[PDB]
């Protein structure tokens, strides 16, 4: 890897045939500064604090996506139509902060070594799907050109109140349920 | 078994060392997970990284406008964004929370801090402990905070006081938490 004090991606441009779909983000020292919602064609912030560090003209992202679609067709041909390898992701679940019963906290489901960037991440509480209080990052880049993605579940710790992060990915043989308990 | 996928990645990567004393742009062109072509501002031209990048490297290097534009992105992207965003982000500070819990073992959990530079020391009474201290890696939470856990193997006498001691750029002086 290149040695440097700080590293930014300006930006991470993803485009894939499945869908097809794309992603446009900027990263600084490994965190997501902003993204472009390509459906609404607007710059947005998963972490709105960082809107203070300047905006972005979404048309740049849209132009890049048009060029990427073109380039992808050409590279598929140059590589004999070799399909992406489905790597095996690794899933880790942990709390953001020390756990006190009845004190609001956040569960973090880290899905690492993702490729291709296609994944279902859902939360189960005592075996039942949770939808409220769930958010997730973009596909965050890695130097080996795989991705990680993190899902968050705000929750209230309580006794006999247990969780699973359920991950579906084509490189798994079955959905992966990673357990966590207070 | 699974659906087929074909992925393209383009990465416009900016590297900064010593403030902006050294700035370097590397644009990476990737098929699936294979980088096949790249532009390195330290080199000034495109290079094929795999044979499949050779058509582009030759083509792109023959277009004066392409070379001029890409070369200018060291200024219009990297230096520009450092002025617009990264200097400020580098001024960002989020103080760590420090909690001790027993397990003989003591666990000092240091959570919810930014940036990632941090130092955690364990003390037994008035002596820093080095043997028997083991740490996790820095853990990235994804929400612009880190955490880390630092464990101390202990054989506690009653009256011994253990101190977890945390230095971080957000702090005028270290945080100290005590366990008796």
């Amino acid at each position: 890897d290149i040695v440097a004090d700080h590293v930014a991606s300006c930006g991470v441009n993803l485009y894939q045939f499945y869908g097809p779909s794309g992603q446009y983000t900027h990263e600084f020292d490994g965190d997501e500064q902003f993204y472009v919602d390509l459906e609404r064609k607007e710059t947005a912030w998963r972490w709105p604090e960082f809107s203070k560090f300047g905006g972005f003209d979404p048309q740049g992202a849209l132009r890049n996506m048009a060029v990427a679609k073109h380039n992808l067709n050409i590279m598929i041909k140059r590589y004999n139509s070799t399909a992406a390898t489905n790597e095996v992701p690794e899933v880790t679940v942990f709390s953001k902060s020390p756990v006190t019963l009845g004190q609001p906290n956040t569960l973090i489901c880290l899905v690492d070594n993702i490729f291709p960037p296609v994944v279902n991440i859902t939360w189960l509480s005592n075996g039942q799907s949770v939808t409220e209080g769930v958010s997730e990052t973009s596909f965050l880049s890695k130097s080996d050109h795989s991705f990680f993605k993190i899902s968050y579940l705000t929750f209230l710790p309580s006794a006999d109140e247990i969780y699973d992060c359920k991950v579906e990915h084509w490189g798994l043989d079955q959905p992966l349920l990673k357990h966590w308990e207070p | 078994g699974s659906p087929e996928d074909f992925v393209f990645q383009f990465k416009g990567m900016c590297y900064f060392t010593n403030g902006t004393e050294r700035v370097r742009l590397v644009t990476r062109y990737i098929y699936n997970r294979e980088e096949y072509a790249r532009f390195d501002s330290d080199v000034g031209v495109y290079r094929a990284v795999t044979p499949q990048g050779r058509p582009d490297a030759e083509y792109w290097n023959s277009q004066k406008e392409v070379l001029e534009g890409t070369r200018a992105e060291l200024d219009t992207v990297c230096r520009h964004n450092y002025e617009v965003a990264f200097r400020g982000i580098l001024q960002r500070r989020v103080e760590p929370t420090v909690t001790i819990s027993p397990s003989n073992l003591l666990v000092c959990s240091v959570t919810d801090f930014y940036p990632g530079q941090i130092k955690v020391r364990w003390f037994r009474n008035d002596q820093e402990e080095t043997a028997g201290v083991v740490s996790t890696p820095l853990i990235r939470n994804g929400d612009w905070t880190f955490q880390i856990l630092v464990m101390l193997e202990m054989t506690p006498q009653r009256g011994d006081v253990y101190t977890c001691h945390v230095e971080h750029p957000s702090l005028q002086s270290p945080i100290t938490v005590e366990w008796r």
Partner: peptide, 20 residues
């Protein structure tokens, strides 16, 4: 006042292909 992004260059095209 705005962040700028690196632009993707348009690949050379028109190559043939082989079916796997």
């Amino acid at each position: 006042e705005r962040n700028a992004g690196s632009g993707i260059i348009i690949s050379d095209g028109g190559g043939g292909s082989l079916v796997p």
